[PDB]
Symmetry: C4
Subunit: 431 residues, 4 copies
């Protein structure tokens, strides 16, 4: 019969609790210093539905360190005892039995909503909103204290001055002005502007003004600190880019690096940063553990999977392995690559874009949409030149495999080995 903690009714009740705690923390001091009808009825019903709230909290489940969800509300009751339930019960104790400073349950209400603050937090802007709200609350409380001192002093205080400036000599100013100027002065000394209209005269309010000045210093410092933290948290990525560019620049100017090579170097730098944004995908790929690593590497194989006929007959373990074994090589359009007379151990398949192969003005293999070039592997097995030089074109996203890696991964399973060698499709074997 017990309700669960994440029930939406509980959340709506929590929002109503927040509204009511704000209401009481705002109206109790303002009525306590400055100040029949159903307002007392509302005040008592506040305590009543907070008693209802503790009843619900015993009814609804809680989250323990061991058990996130547990039944048997008696356990919830014994967990709440000697803790926040004592606070919320003091908040649920009527104190009607004037003397308004005994309404300290309202501050316990704010303590328990501060217990709910972490749930309320989603991003950094909400933090700024909460800081502004507590700024306003501190201001209102200090204004109530200031008005209380002003009343006590009058039997030369700021009240007589106020009677003089806004013309109501003493009569007396209305309760509207008698609070607006209080709040005005509380900000006048909290954000450190300090106007000359209202200013302390006798001793007590000078002591109070010292206290307000110190509080303002502290909290204004806190606001600066948080705002600076956020702004730096974004200019951190900004500075990452700037330091990357600076290191590149330092290398370039250190070794002279005449105009052609340099310009290719920097243009490649912005080309890289355009998509990698400084962070390499290789490191984060290695961070993900084995099986997930293969799976995310398997997603990149929507290119050679379906277009290679032998690949279809392969077993899924072979798919995963031979998939992780590939290297999809990015290169910006307009690159020259492996020459003739080099090693042939760097086996190459075609993955994306299009490239042309110029061996002494002999352009061949103008393909590039999931095609294949390279060397035979059974008999040749000889490093050297395949056909000759390659020539630059549009997107040079090629497909690196190794001549030792492919063999070691392939020879463990001879059935797909044979099925692979039988359907040896090469769009243009450069010989």
């Amino acid at each position: 019969w017990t309700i669960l903690h994440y029930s939406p009714f509980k959340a709506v009740w929590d929002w109503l609790i927040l509204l009511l705690v704000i209401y009481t923390a705002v109206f109790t001091p303002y009525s306590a210093a400055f100040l029949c009808q159903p307002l007392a009825v509302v005040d008592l019903i506040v305590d009543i539905m907070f008693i209802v709230d503790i009843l619900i909290n015993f009814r609804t489940t809680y989250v323990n360190a061991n058990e996130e969800v547990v039944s048997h509300p008696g356990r919830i009751a014994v967990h709440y005892f000697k803790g926040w339930f004592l606070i919320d019960m003091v908040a649920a104790i009527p104190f009607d039995l004037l003397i308004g400073l005994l309404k300290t349950a309202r501050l316990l209400r704010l303590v328990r909503v501060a217990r709910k603050l972490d749930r309320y937090s989603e991003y950094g802007a909400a933090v700024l909103f909460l800081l502004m709200c507590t700024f306003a609350l501190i201001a209102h409380w200090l204004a109530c204290i200031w008005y209380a001192i002003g009343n006590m002093e009058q039997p030369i205080g700021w009240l007589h001055n106020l009677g003089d400036q806004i013309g109501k000599p003493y009569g007396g100013p209305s309760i509207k002005d008698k609070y607006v100027t209080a709040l005005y002065f509380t900000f006048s000394s909290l954000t450190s502007v300090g106007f000359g209209n209202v200013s302390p005269n006798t001793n007590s309010e000078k002591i109070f003004s010292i206290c307000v000045m110190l509080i303002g210093s502290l909290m204004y410092a806190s606001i600066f600190g948080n705002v600076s933290a956020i702004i730096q948290r974004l200019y951190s990525g900004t500075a990452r880019y700037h330091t990357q560019m600076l290191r590149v620049r330092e290398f370039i100017r250190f070794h002279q690096i005449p105009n052609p090579l340099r310009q290719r170097l920097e243009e490649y730098f912005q080309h890289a940063w355009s998509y990698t944004n400084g962070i390499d995908m290789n490191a984060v790929l290695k961070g993900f553990p084995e099986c997930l690593q293969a799976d995310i590497c398997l997603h990149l194989n929507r290119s050679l999977l379906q277009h290679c006929k032998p690949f279809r007959g392969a077993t899924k373990g072979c798919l995963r392995a031979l998939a992780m074994k590939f290297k999809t090589t990015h290169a910006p359009p307009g690159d020259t690559l492996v020459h003739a007379g080099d090693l042939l151990t760097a086996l190459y398949f075609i993955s994306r874009g299009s490239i042309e192969i110029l061996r002494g003005d002999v352009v061949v293999a103008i393909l590039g949409k999931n095609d294949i070039f390279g060397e035979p592997l059974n008999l040749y097995a000889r490093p050297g030149k395949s056909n000759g030089d390659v020539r630059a074109l549009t997107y040079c996203d090629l497909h690196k495999i190794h001549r030792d890696d492919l063999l070691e991964v392939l020879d463990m399973y001879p059935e797909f080995s044979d099925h692979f060698w039988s359907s040896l499709e090469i769009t243009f074997n450069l010989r």
Copy 2:
């Protein structure tokens, strides 16, 4: 007969010294500018127990660079000579012989308590408390100077104004107001609020006001700096989390990564951060040197140690080695793992949670509480399929060993080799 330095009586004496230095640094200027009875007796007894203090310091031990504790108080005396003992002796010299500016020993008292400041420091909040205290002290001294200038000017100064606002025209205001307004004004120009009630009129106090404004600028900047440093020191961990998530997000959106695979990737990300909190435990494990490394790796072996019968007969060196050789593999509930037709060199034991093994809808080995599966090792020694696919369940905390590592670590000691192969317990050998 000598006392040692860390005696509690010495610490209590140090606290009393702190109380007395605060007392003197507060009351000497206030009596010097604004101002029979035992107060002179108290002032002289101050010097007396500071002489007692230097006597104790010669009696009690000190900490040298070479010897932390040394006897023979003569060595302590020769070490103190020409140094802080000269300062504390000047502080222990009576200057009774008005002229109150000669009481410069009080500032040396503050210098020597600043020597004790590092001991007083425990965390960052104490730093803020000390900054607030020195703020108050600077304020009090500047207020005393301000009152002195005010007295000198009166033969138009702020004193006559003060006589005019709080009604005591000249008579004259009481010594209570004649100091409260001084402190009020000193804050008025130190936290940069600048009220209009009291303000410099003649030339001398305008020069003084310039000096106060500059001092306030400097120290207010210092307070902002420290508070910002602390707040950034916490949002550092915040930003670490945010940049980790950002790199993950960038990888995800770079390579498309359709909804199923992506959602598993991020959910695994929060699962990891839930307990690792960004920092990998592997790095800190490798940081700890060899023997401690094995010992802390030995603590993780409360799982396979007592439940493996052959393990009990093993020698402790074998325990340490074979313990460091394991890899306790974390995996969140709901993971698929090594298939059939793969390599068998990845030997696997059961460490925590529970998992099920589905080879073509054939679920076997539903164990998982410190159990064992895998392949025989003596005769088989062949990569391939063991039984087939595994199926996802609750906590997938498995137990990686290697087929080359275990052999190389085990074959160095044939007695436990034989005892191990004899008691070859496997809860379900997947064949």
Copy 3:
């Protein structure tokens, strides 16, 4: 017939749009609160050439996610629909049909120029300029609001005071002063100075003053944050240097390191930082991918390329490989190096500067401008002493090759192998 987006005429039009939006956002409120002729003609022509602007935007090309440049202006039109074109069309709708608050199209103009803000940004100083500009705009708007409240209150407000201080009792002050003091007061509460000349008296302007104080707090915090971010972004490189120096110092006085060794260590440290500036060139060299890596490593080979006769006959692949295989070794003047009786596998060529070779006061090989020393390789192949010790001189930039690396890279191609061994030029083979 369509114009392209990057046409200079479009950029000049954008600059004119910026000028006109500034003009309107400045003059519309000032005329709306404080305030025949062609000014209405100018105001309407503003809307007219903004209609012209949307016509051009449909005519000129745009940049899509897939296509950077696309023809067929109908596509541009359908892309603009339901988006920024609605905003710019509301800005292009005349509202002549007093009531000046309906001119909300001017704020949409500022929104769309904020869309162009990223293009306007080049560095950080422009950011500070834009922040100052928006500061001025906020000030002007708040001054207009303040003047409006002042007019409303007059049927004790600040207007009567203004009539009293600058002598024009009521008559009334000219519209020049009636605005200069407004702006004066708006800064008086925005940068938190708070003069006493003009200050709120009745209730409405006290509420307004509270609002201004809060806005000033926020934006002043923002300015501090940005400036601190930039200054820290430079002292970051400063602190990098300092932390390198500190680590060096830590190592120095941990291990004593008497004066000769210490001094050579720090002098080498400053020598290194003089040109490497902390960042190693090795890391950035490895960062650049293969082909570019070789090409930039090939640029360093303007030293041994043209002066080695066998090198000329070599094939370009051999050039690239044997070029990447070298290590140009930096060493400051005044270094001692490999002794006799050591290994000879560290083959050494001469790259820059000059050095002396002293084997028992026998100085030989006073060369160093692209010269060669070392050992024979065909028959000798023996570790040991070559001739003996070296002697320090000016720039010790030597040329490391390996005795296994050179062979493995050279033996793959026997034609240049033979051509190399035939022209075996060694300026002084130390035997």
Copy 4:
């Protein structure tokens, strides 16, 4: 006959130039706004010795990009032409031919001393001093401008008020007050305090006040930024320590790690941080290149060098190699180490402190001051137990060598091989 640039006379001349530029930049405006005798003689002699200065600069050497020191002052002259020499010559042109704003050469003097600012910089405190100095200069200039406006307005400005407050009604205040209040007001609006004694009344000084407020905002922000940068630059090391401790703590509480082992872990952590301070010495050891690396590693060999008799006959290359081959192992007092039944390939010598060897309550080898234990190497060559367990004592700074490393480094030179095996001193070979 030419003087060199680093001559001390040149430095003394530079200091005199600094004094004179400060003098002129201070007195020229104060004479120009507020204000026979040799002061004109001094003013002209200023230009005279600045002409002398440019004469010296042509005489003395300069530093070029290629040549740090070069003779032939004609080259210095042609280098100075069309550059800073034009500025210094304009500064060396007399403008006597009132109008005091034409003395713009004084600002060029400040520009050229700003060229010398980098030389003046040694640390961060000098930066703060220079910022304070330029703060004072900006204040003085703004005060001169303010006084000029005040004079112009008088034919209700602040001058009449000043005549009223300090009693000198108009007569008029002395030139002392007529400047002290100017500086007072310039700070009143620059550090954002804003007193009420002096305040703008007519339009001109309100515009000026707006400008001053903006300048104060900017420069006050700059001061905050720099101070925060320095304070963060120290709390950076603070935060390094804190994050190290945090990672250690997270590992500790993640894996439970019961009290004995945990306590050993943190006590070792503090012991490490006591001397390494987070900075690992291995990294900086590997950072220093080869020869210097061996030399600084050779300094650690004042322990086994002189006490090993065979070591003396060794060749210096063997010294260097066998020295770099060692590992001086730090361990805090109270550690247990390699047991029996383990591998013997970890050869161990005694380096520092003292340790005891307990094999079944059989304590042997109580040495430790540059002594030797271990196993024979010629015939034994068998992993296993040497004698048995070791027992904890004071400083466990032991001496790691390897059984493969020592052989491979030793067998390249058989003469010291034989001399080593002949004088095979082992203080206690644990058998």
